Structures are given as C-alpha cells and as structure tokens.
Paper text:
Here, we instead performed the collection of NHE9* at pH 6.5 where NHE9 is thought to be less active, and therefore presumably less dynamic. Overall, we collected ~4300 movies and the final 3D-reconstruction contained data of ~244,300 particles, from which an EM map could be reconstructed to 3.3 Å according to the gold-standard Fourier shell correlation (FSC) 0.143 criterion. Selecting 42% of the particles for heterogeneous refinement, enabled an improved cryo-EM map reconstruction of NHE9* at pH 6.5, with additional map features for the TM2-TM3 loop domain. For model building we therefore generated a composite map, by combining the maps before and after masked refinement, with an overall resolution estimate of 3.6 Å, although the final model resolution is worse at 4.0 Å resolution. We were able to refine the overall position of the short linker and β-hairpin strand predicted from the AlphaFold228 model. The loop domain reconnects to the beginning of TM3 via a short extracellular helix (ECH1), which was well supported by the cryo-EM maps. The β-hairpins were predicted by AlphaFold228 to be domain-swapped, and this structure refines well into the map density. The centre of the loop domain has a cluster of positively-charged residues K105, K107 and R108 from each of the two protomers. Overall, the TM2-TM3 β-loop domain clasps the two protomers together on the luminal side and forms a highly positively-charged cluster that is positioned above the dimerization domain interface. As such, the improved NHE9* structure is consistent with its previously proposed requirement for binding negatively-charged PIP2 lipids at the interface.
Residue numbers in the entry:
A (entry chain B), B (entry chain A): 17 to 496, 518 to 546
Write the structure that this text describes.
C-alpha cells in the first residue's frame, strides 16, 4: 500500500500550515489574505517544489498488446489468463503516447482526484451549509431583487461572454494561430455559463468581520447562493443541446426543448427538496424525539443525505435540490428541534463546510499536477478577462436601474460599485472546468479559468479594504405588503394561516 | 450514472427503518434487541427479499480475448485501440467462469464494499471514539489486570482454537469429506487469532443503561478495547510467517523473528501515537487557540487524521496507533482545550462512531450478497462453536485465579460468569475475514465467523437481562501505591512531577 496515505498526509500537513499561517496573520491583524488564499498559495508552493525536486529519473512506458477482435472499449472486461478470469475496469483515457517518455520523467506523485469527488462529497456539504445558514432577518424585502439578479444577470453575462469569446476566436482565426473550425458558438456558450458562478467567500468573511450594512451583505450572499445553481443548471442544459443534423447550427428547433428540460429539472429538484423537507418536518412534529438529540440529529442527517441521493438518482441536479432542501429545513424544522440538536447540527455542518472549502482551495492551488495544461495564447486570456469584466459591468447597472424604476422605497445607490469589485469565482467554475478533459478547447478553458481565479481572488482579497474605505461604506453597524409586489405579503399570510399551525407551533421543543 | 446512488439510498432507508424500530422498541421498553441487532436483521431481510425478487432473467457472459505475449497481470495497463491509448485498472479476480451463467442470473445489485473501506474509514473512527471515551475514573487500579487479560488470554484462546480446529480438520480427513493437505496449522492459527476480538457493544450499552457496578464495566470495556488491537497485530504477525523451505513446517527458526516484528510494530505504533499526542498538546499549550474553537477543533481533527495516515504509511498497524493516540489525547489535551471545543469534539466523534457502527452492522446483516459462500459442513461449525466456548472458558478462570493470588485486596468473584456470557464478536473479526477472498479455507472461515456472529449477538442480546437477574449483579449504582505493583504509583508521581507542569496547568482554558 502506502499510496494514498502519503498524499493524504501531505494534504493534512498543508492544511495545518495554512491554519497556522492564518492564525499568525490574524494575531498581527495584517489581513490582506484569507484562508482560501493561504491554502491556494501553499498548494502552489508545494506544486512548485514537487515539480522540480526529482525530475531526472528513469523512463517508464506501458507495454502494448495487439488484442484481436476488439472494436470497442467496455467499462468492465473479463480477461482469461492461466485458466483464471480477472476483472478489469476502465478508468480514464490517456492519449499522449507521443509524450509518454516525458510523462514518465518527473512522475513523482499524481495526487489526482476523480472529477466526481468535487460534485458528490465536497460541494454538497458547502451548498447545504450555505442554504441552512440563513439569517431569517431581512433577505425578504429584497428577495425579489435577488431573484431578478440571479436569473436575468447570469443569462446576460453568459450571452455577453459567449459573444465576446466568439469574436476573439474569429480574430484568432484571422491571425491563424491554429486550425479554424474546432471552436464553435456552443463552446462559447458553455464557457460563458461556466464563468457565471460567483462565490465571494473572502468578501463575505470581511463583511461579517467588519459588520457592514446588512442589506448589501444579504444581497451579495443571496446572489452568490442562487447564481451557482443557476449557472450549474444552465451549463447542464447547454451540454444537453445537440442538434440532430448540421452540427453547431443556429435555431435548430432545439431551443424550446432545451428550455423545457431546464424548467422541468429545476421544478423537479425544487419539488423533491420541498417534499423531503415537509416529510421530515411532519415526522419530527408527530414524534417526540426532543428527548433524544442524537437520534433526531442522525435522522435529520440521514434524511438530508437521502434527499440528495434521490435527487442525484432521478437524473436531476443535486446541488439545487440540496440547496432548496436546506433552506426549507432552516425555515421549518428549526422551530421544532431541541435546543441542543440545533447547536449540534449547526456545528457539524459548519465544520464540514470549513473542511470542504479548505480542501477545495488547497487542491485548486495545485496547478502543476496536470500534465495536459495548455497555458498559452495570452490574447485568449486577455479576451476572457475583458469578457468577464464587461459581463460584470452589464450585469449590475442595467438591472439596478430597472429595479430602481419600480423600487420599493429603498434605493441601493453606491452599492453597485462594491458588487462590481466583488467578482470572485468559486469552486463551481473549477469543478465544471475539471469535469471535462481530453479536449484542447476544454483544456484551454480550464487553464484560463484557473489563471483568472488565481488573479482575481488574490487581487480582490488584497484590495477589498481599500475599496471599502474609498466608497465610504458604513461599517460597525450592529445587526440587532403593497411594496413587496403584493405577492410576498399574500405568501406570508398563507404560510402563517395554514402551514404554520400544522407544521409547527405545537409539540415539546 | 445512477449506480451508487441507488445502493446508498437503500442503505439510508434501512438505517432510517432501523432507527424507527429502535425508537418503537424503546418506547414500549420491550428491550431484548439492540440497534446493532436491528440493523443486522434489517440487512438480512433486505438480502432475502432482493435475492428472490427478479431471479428469472437473461444470462450475461463476458467476452474472452486471446491476448498474446501476456504472461503476467499488471495492476495498470495501457491498451491501444483506434490509435488511442486507454488505461485499464485491475480490480478483482473472479475465477468462477463455470458458474458464470448462474452468476448472471439474479445479478440484481452487487452492493459490495472494498475490504479496505472497513479498515481505512469505518474502523478508525470507532477505535478513536473508544480510546477518547475514557471515564478517567477507576480503570487504573485494575489496569494491570486488563493488560494481563488482553495479552495472555488472547494468545491462550488463539492457541486453544487453533489446536481444536486442527483436531477437527484431522477428524474430517478421517471422515474424508474433501482432499487432505489443503488445510494447515497456520490456517488454524490464523482462525484462532481472527476469533479473538470481542466487542460486547450491546452488553456495554445495557450496563450503561442499568448503571451496573463500574468495576465490571471498566474491566469489560478495557478488555474489548485492547484485545481488538492485540488480535489484529497478532493476525498480521501470523500472516507474516512464511518459512523459506518446507512450507507449513514447525519451528523453522522464524518464530523469533515473527515475535521481534510483532514487538517492533507495536512499539513503533505506540511511539508514533505518543509523539503525535505530545506534539499537539505542546502546540495547543504554546498557542492561544482557546478564543477560536473552530480552528483548534479542526487542528485537532487534522492532527489525529495525520497521525493515522503516518501510522498507515510507516508500514505499522494504524488501529493500535489510533487507539493510543486517542487515549493519550484524552489524557493530556482534554485539559487544555476550551469548554466549547471539548463538547464539539465529543459530539462529532460520538456521531461519527454511531454512524460507522450502524453502517457496519447494516452491512454485516447482508449475507446473501456474496455468491462465493461455502456454508456447509455443520461439523466444522460445531467444532468452531466448541472451540470458541472452551477458549472463552479457559481465558477467564485461570487468569482470574492467577490475579486472585496476588490480588490488590479486591477479589472480583462472581463477575467471571458475566464475562463468560459476554462473548460477542465485533467488526474486527468480520473485517479480517472479509479481507482475504478467493480461497476455499478463507471462504469457509468467513462463513463460519458470520454464522457465529449472527447466532451469538442475537442470543446474548436476548439473554443478557435474564443472565443479569440470575447472577444477582448489583444495578442502579450511581457513578458519583504498594498494592498497585509499586510501579503505577511511581508512574503517577513521574507524570505529576515533570510532565504535568509543562504540558498543562498553564494557559487560558
């Protein structure tokens, strides 16, 4: 053995060093760096010192066998050797036999992770923690604004990024860097959808530490929570798009079915999450598990995991379903659990979220582990930077003005610049980029996204405090109907009229 | 996808049903059944209803390719199809091509788990929880007795079981059930070492619920904690034994080196655990992490995991190292953490232990999932039952009398019968049996161990209360030097003289 133990120990040591450095920085109050940035820089240092440590070594090349009557590559295969049948499993495709002697040199440790690990065990805890951690104060008078942002602006930014990337691809074809025809507008739309999820975790941490006005913090948190799921589902829908004939056509009568599939997946995920939440709320309400905190906590965790697994198995997107289940749980079941169970669940979920985000950023800081990197064509990177900048610019101001037209007597002026400055890219974009491999445009997009994240997270973590001071943003503020489209008040009345007396308000807490 | 999600959802549903049934049983105070027994019976029911659900189906047979120039089976292989190289990984060997048409029928869902999962992610949490959960009261005046039991009695029971199994194998050869020569005394020793770990989890739960005299409870808990690691290391040492010539010989000059390897592995694991514990204790003592419960809790968890990983990568046994690290942590670092961090760590570890044991017992009840079962030869099962009974009989009474000779003025009389009745076999034996496969004696031993566990856990859970009432064991008792071999007092004085003032007694808690 002694294969995964070494890499896991290295990851643990890097996490310990990151925690120690964060404690040292916070002791001197230097700031200018977050735990995510520390983890990423430590991962970069580890990769740099591992790449150039034992590069001169032997060359290992795998043997080639001429397997006759083999026109397909099944996932599972049975090979009969010495009158004994052995099972072989297909894992990954490596089509770099030409550079195989170079790959053998400086092999060191691959330290690679399966792309589904980030989607099955790392992201869902973070999504559930984000959904459950609702202040339950405010976030409702501006809920419509958050929804309008996270819906319209994400699509607008995706379209703008796709158009600008298509234009830059045309310019490159004019320059003739490589072959013309490989890139397509579908790839541009995929890249735009991928570069639409924002997770300003450092910005949110700074806002919480400095006690900024809760309105801007709630708006940013809601946007970051919703746009991640919106971008994930949009990326899945774009990946579904496949015309029957004339590939990469325009208006091939498949837009309507793609939109229908998107709406159906979103509605199914929301319905499944709500159904699981109401089922567990009713189960807790009828039972008297308030005297057994361990049993009710375990039941809650198992029910949440079962909801996630049911969402994944049904063919829908598990992230959005988990988010909706978590927010509905925090809305309803939080008033029925015992006092100790609430604290236990909150501590467990926040610890899991912290560990998951630390591991995610530590692995993201590892940039030298991938041999199939395509970091070149600086014009492409510059075009991507301009596209994301202009997409962020057009996301806020037009929607902000449109909301200010029918504004609810609360003008959010001068806060748009802070939203412009908060343009971090979270783990969703990295996971989506790393999901697809062995493709030149995919590798180029992954490298560009990684470089953009490395630049933007560091620069915005460095400049958040000067930006806050320059805009005269109020800090240190203690947290302690008709205007709402006439629909939010009706929903609140309906909830307090029928749902509340049956789902809660009775039973020992 | 939709492969692991279905089985995980089935596991979650089984766990929920087990929890509901346990709550129903506890509401009526019927008892006579534990959560482990409920999980096992639910798994058995699920296996029974899954085996006979869709048995009539098609026959699937894997294709066979004549791969020339292939005299070995590498773990990783590279196959060139259509001028593209694909990586194939060797997973498992299935040498049942003759019964392959039968295997294809009623395939259903394999729901199998990797044998190293039980050793890398399931057992270590349970071991760490058991080591950390020390009462810190008593357990020291009888520590020598616990050590003498867990060391001498385990070896005596292993020897007795091996001798009796060898005798029964000779009797079978006389009866001529199968070929003579396949079995060996080494296999008997392996079986004896495997059938030496006792985990009376139901008995411990009953004792804790009924508030029995703490002396017997502490003795049983210490024996169950120590003998698991003792048996694991003994089994590893037995597996190491391999004579150079004349295989399965007696006194081949390898007993001395095997004992030396056993002692070295145990000493190295203990030293590594103690080193990690003192390192984290000093790190907590010097730092002021009492104001950051999240940071110190995460650091503690990461340090424990890193200690486990270092033990695994060092070539030693990780279970014993984890146990020693946990007990040393509970001894030293528990007095340095903040008041909230202690509760957070305890709740997290107890929840992890509960989930791990529930999953272990749910999977253990699945007996019909393994197609390569060898449940026959009832004489072998009867011999194993007699061997384990006589091993339990000879483990307690001789050692009890020897301790009563130089007894520390506290005669533990009439408690030996209860220790005889508590003869449960825990997850260690099942994991050791399932580690090795594709071998007729190994399969027979695994089947016999599974049947013995299924019988003994259920019968002892049913009969613990009548046994407790018959022996007039005191219940309901509230918990609130020279006699100790003259060495325990010296150790206590040394700890309180030098180690305590530096490791603890200073710093904000």
């Amino acid at each position: 053995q002694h294969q995964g133990a070494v890499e896991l120990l290295v990851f643990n040591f890097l996490l310990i060093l990151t925690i120690l450095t964060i404690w040292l920085f916070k002791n001197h109050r230097f700031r200018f760096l977050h735990e995510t940035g520390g983890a990423m820089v430590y991962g970069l240092i580890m990769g740099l010192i591992l790449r150039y440590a034992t590069a001169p070594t032997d060359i290992e090349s795998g043997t080639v066998y001429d397997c006759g009557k083999l026109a397909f590559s099944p996932s599972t295969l049975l090979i009969n050797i010495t009158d004994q049948v052995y099972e072989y499993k297909y894992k990954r495709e490596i089509s770099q036999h030409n550079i195989n002697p170079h790959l053998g040199n400086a092999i060191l440790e691959k330290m690679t992770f399966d792309p589904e690990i980030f989607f099955n065990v790392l992201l869902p805890p973070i999504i559930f923690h984000a959904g459950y951690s609702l202040k339950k104060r405010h976030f409702f008078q501006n809920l419509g604004s958050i929804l309008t942002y996270a819906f319209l602006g994400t699509a607008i930014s995706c379209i703008v990024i796709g158009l600008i990337m298509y234009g830059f691809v045309k310019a490159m074809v004019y320059a003739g860097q490589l072959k013309n025809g490989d890139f397509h507008f579908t790839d541009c739309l995929f890249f735009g959808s991928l570069m639409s999820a924002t997770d300003p975790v450092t910005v949110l941490a700074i806002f919480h530490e400095l006690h900024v006005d809760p309105d801007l913090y709630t708006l940013l948190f809601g946007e970051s929570v919703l746009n991640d799921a919106v971008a994930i589902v949009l990326t899945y829908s774009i990946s579904i798009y496949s015309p029957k004939e004339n590939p990469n056509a325009f208006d091939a009568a498949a837009f309507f079915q793609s939109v229908g599939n998107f709406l159906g997946i979103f509605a199914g995920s929301f319905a499944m999450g709500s159904a699981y939440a109401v089922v567990t709320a009713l189960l807790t309400k009828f039972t008297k598990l308030c005297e057994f905190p361990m049993l009710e906590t375990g039941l809650f965790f198992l029910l949440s995991w079962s909801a996630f697994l049911s969402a994944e198995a049904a063919g829908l997107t598990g992230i959005v379903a988990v988010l909706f289940c978590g927010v509905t749980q925090a809305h309803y079941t939080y008033n029925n659990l015992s006092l100790d169970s609430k604290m236990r669940t909150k501590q467990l979920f926040e610890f899991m979220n912290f560990l998951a985000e630390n591991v995610i950023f530590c692995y993201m800081g590892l940039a030298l582990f991938t041999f199939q990197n395509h970091i070149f064509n600086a014009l492409f990177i510059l075009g991507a930077f301009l596209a994301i900048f202009v997409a962020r610019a057009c996301n806020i101001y037009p929607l902000s003005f449109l909301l200010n037209l029918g504004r609810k007597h609360k003008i959010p002026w001068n806060f748009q610049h802070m939203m412009m400055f908060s343009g971090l890219r979270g783990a969703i974009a990295f996971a989506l980029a790393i999901r697809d491999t062995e493709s030149q445009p995919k590798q180029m997009m992954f490298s560009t996204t990684l470089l953009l994240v490395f630049f933007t997270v560091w620069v915005f973590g460095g400049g958040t405090t000067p930006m806050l001071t320059w805009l005269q943003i109020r800090v240190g503020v203690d947290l302690d109907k008709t205007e709402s489209a006439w629909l939010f008040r009706m929903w609140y009345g309906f909830d307090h009229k029928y749902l509340k007396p049956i789902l809660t308000h009775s039973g020992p807490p």
